[PDB]
Design a binder for these strands. Sequence first.
DNA 1: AGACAGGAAGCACTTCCTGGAG
DNA 2: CTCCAGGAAGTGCTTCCTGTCT
Lengths: 129, 129
Amino acid sequence: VRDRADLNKDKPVIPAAALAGYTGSGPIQLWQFLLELLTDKSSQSFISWTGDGWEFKLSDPDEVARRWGKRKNKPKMNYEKLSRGLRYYYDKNIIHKTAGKRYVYRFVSDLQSLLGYTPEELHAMLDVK
Amino acid sequence: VRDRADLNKDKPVIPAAALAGYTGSGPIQLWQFLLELLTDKSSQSFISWTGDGWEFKLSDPDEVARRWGKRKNKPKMNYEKLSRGLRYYYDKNIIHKTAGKRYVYRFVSDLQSLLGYTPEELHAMLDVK
DNA sequence: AGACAGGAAGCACTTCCTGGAG
DNA sequence: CTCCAGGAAGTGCTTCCTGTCT
């Protein structure tokens, strides 16, 4: 059995650069970035899936903001501003706020027809219940 | 003498990403993009310094646009549009258009005191004139 | 107080287009 | 024609602020 296919490795399952390159959507966007962090085993301490579908929660809001800023060269980035970005998604039907729960948002389920992966397949690949 | 791990190889003398990080100017901008290609030995075939100060020339506009498009994930990018972005630099005083010379522009923001380099030195680190 | 909704203004283009000069 | 100038509209935030709830 020479032809070995040991899947991927230890890198974000859905990296932002590739997603954005694939869709030719322009420079990387906030939701694409959060998607990368979420499909990456290591990032799991400051951002994770709540287990309920596409609902995710920013366990440590500032760590996520710090990286968002470091990624776009916006040193003064933080959650108060990062979140304004999310609120604009409410109309564009991309992400919605999970009312009543601190730091909790949910992608619209149509992300599944774009990614090709099911929230459950993604949960499995990583490790969440 | 092992401490001879001191190179000056084939990587841009001024990467756009690092320049942006150094200034914390946000996503890579077009003028930073062209700066990187101009300070990269391997790109002297489609874009290069004309030898007069910071005057540069797009010897192959389409290749520059293509590359520009690939950096920001905008596959439909062409010179027609890249040059529109350049024109918006006139009122911002970042670039001046050499009149009577196809595809020739000049950086006019004070690049020397921001990069620390000199038109001459950069000309030296490269083989231009 | 911090989380959160959304108005307002600004930034750096990207995309479309009229129009003028060589 | 192609280059080139610049108007006008739109995107995806970034930055700032009022106001509400909790």
